[PDB]
């Protein structure tokens, strides 16, 4: 994990997230690995959810391999579980409301 | 006006309403319109068309395959069958176009 845990200004264009310990999240962003850890757990989601739209399907699939490309649910303490259809769509990883297609 | 000769025949105006209702009676068309439909339609055709979709910070390129049969039977009954399948443009599995994982 990081050795610098709460020293960075808020990043902009992040593309990955990683759990190193039970309290610190590591956002892989173009400036590097910016780590954060709040006072409380069950607020890691407030940091991770701001960059969920930048996740690709392979990163999502390798965050939980045995779940077979089904959308993932972000738990409050940062853990990943397999989603269910009645879970909230804002806390679901990889599911979509409208497919962003375009014809050539 | 060969292109406009059979543009608005009763079969092509009746089939969208037939497919959108649970019942449309037992007789809808006549024999002359069935002959017109048999004369104006190809037996079979297939097209491939290409569309890109935005997957996270990346993209996925995919193909709609649209194939269709048009037929007139011996009892002057018309038929128009359409198969529309979605494929990934380089044969990749569990992609965004095969499985968008939509929520309604």
């Amino acid at each position, epitope marked *: 994990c990081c050795e610098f845990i709460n020293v960075n200004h808020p990043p902009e264009r992040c*593309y990955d997230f990683k759990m190193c310990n039970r309290f610190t999240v590591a956002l892989r*962003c173009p400036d*590097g690995e910016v780590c954060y850890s709040p006072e409380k757990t069950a607020e890691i989601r407030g940091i991770v959810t701001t960059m969920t739209h930048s996740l690709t399907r392979q990163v999502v699939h390798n965050k939980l391999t045995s779940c077979n490309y089904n959308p993932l649910y972000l738990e409050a303490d940062g853990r990943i579980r397999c989603g269910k259809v009645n879970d909230k769509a804002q806390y679901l990883l990889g599911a979509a409301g409208s497919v962003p297609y375009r014809w050539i | 006006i060969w292109y406009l000769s059979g543009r608005n025949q009763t079969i092509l105006q009746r089939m969208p309403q037939t497919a959108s209702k649970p019942s449309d009676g037992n007789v809808q068309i006549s024999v002359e319109d069935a002959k017109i439909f048999g004369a104006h339609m190809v037996p079979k055709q297939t097209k491939l068309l290409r569309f890109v979709v935005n997957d996270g*910070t990346r993209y996925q390129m995919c193909v709609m395959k649209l194939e269709s049969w048009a037929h007139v039977f011996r009892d002057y009954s018309v038929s128009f069958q359409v198969r529309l399948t979605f494929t990934e443009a380089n044969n990749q599995t569990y992609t965004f176009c095969t499985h968008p994982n939509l929520i309604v």
Partner: antibody
Amino acid sequence: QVQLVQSGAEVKKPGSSVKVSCKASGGTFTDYALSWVRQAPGQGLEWMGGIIPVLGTPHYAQKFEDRVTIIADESTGTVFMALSSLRSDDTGMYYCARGVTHPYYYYAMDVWGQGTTITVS
Amino acid sequence: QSALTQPASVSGSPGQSISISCTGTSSDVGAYDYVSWYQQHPGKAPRLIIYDVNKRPSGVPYRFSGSKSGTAASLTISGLQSEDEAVYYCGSYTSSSAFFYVFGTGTMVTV
């Protein structure tokens, strides 16, 4: 087999612009992806940009967005590089590169040009 | 990362097999696969010896052998000869917002 042929070597004064051209042969030009890889003499390789022809969006790196412009004009398999605000760190070895296995997806970097030298001092 | 973390130089002896390592992030290598390798002699253009992870084109020799485990990748060159003395780079497709292709720092394999 697909072949790649670049332009000649160039000396550039600081504060100028460069117009590097690349041509290809023996392959499907539009479906497959093209890219430009620059290396300094004291540095390794670096992907800076590329284009898949007739897609509408060339791709740029974040270190080259404000200076590098990519044009894929002409009916032949050519591509053109307009880079502005030349500095001393822009001196190096440039390579046209193109893939032949997987179209549209920047997966591998199959064929390479012989390269050009852009020297700024 | 800005580049794949790669050694500076590995100098294995002739007649032996050597292994070149490459460690990247879980958004570059190990998620997308497509771990490509490149060869550069000092005057020549780069040459693709291994693409995908293990696919080896017919135009490159049989001796190279690439693999991926976890977020790490390895290239085992068996039976080192004098032609192998070159700079070897790694490369991968990425989900990074900064760019699209990640290039390794390059190992100078001197025989």
